[PDB]
Each structure stands twice: as structure tokens, then as C-alpha cells.
Write a protein that binds this ligand. Sequence first.
Ligand SMILES: [Mg+2]
Ligand SMILES: [Mg+2]
Length: 81
Amino acid sequence: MVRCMKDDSKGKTEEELSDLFRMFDKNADGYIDLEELKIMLQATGETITEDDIEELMKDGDKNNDGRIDYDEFLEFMKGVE
Ligand SMILES: [Mg+2]
Ligand SMILES: [Mg+2]
């Protein structure tokens, strides 16, 4: 009423990255494959090789399952040095 009201609703948090994760997906399945991630790359203004595209998979696939999920991907955009 005066100070305590509703729950803490900060500005842009991690969840905000959810909007960026979907962008990487084309079929909206929650997981990105080598074929999907390739589309987002080709669409770019530059030219990317197959090797570069694969480098992204291994760089975001910690479980080595074959696809990247919002969980493991979240860390991807949380520093890539
Ligand atoms: Mg996909
Ligand atoms: Mg994975």
C-alpha cells in the first residue's frame, strides 16, 4: 500500500533473454540444431562456413546431446570469451 506491494519486478532480467532465444529458433521447439542455427547465420549480411556454424554447437552444447536448450544457451550469451 505505502511501500510493500506486489512482488519484486525489476527491469530487464535473465528471462528477457527468452525473447532472444526464440529468435534463434525457426520451428519454435525450444531446441536449436545445426540445420536451424545455420539459417540464422546465412540470413546475416556476411558469409559463414560450415565449420564456423558447427563451432557454435560445440560451444553451446555442454551435454553433447546434439542440440542447445534455453538452459545451456543462457550461459552462452552470458560471456563468450
Ligand atoms: Mg529449432
Ligand atoms: Mg545440449
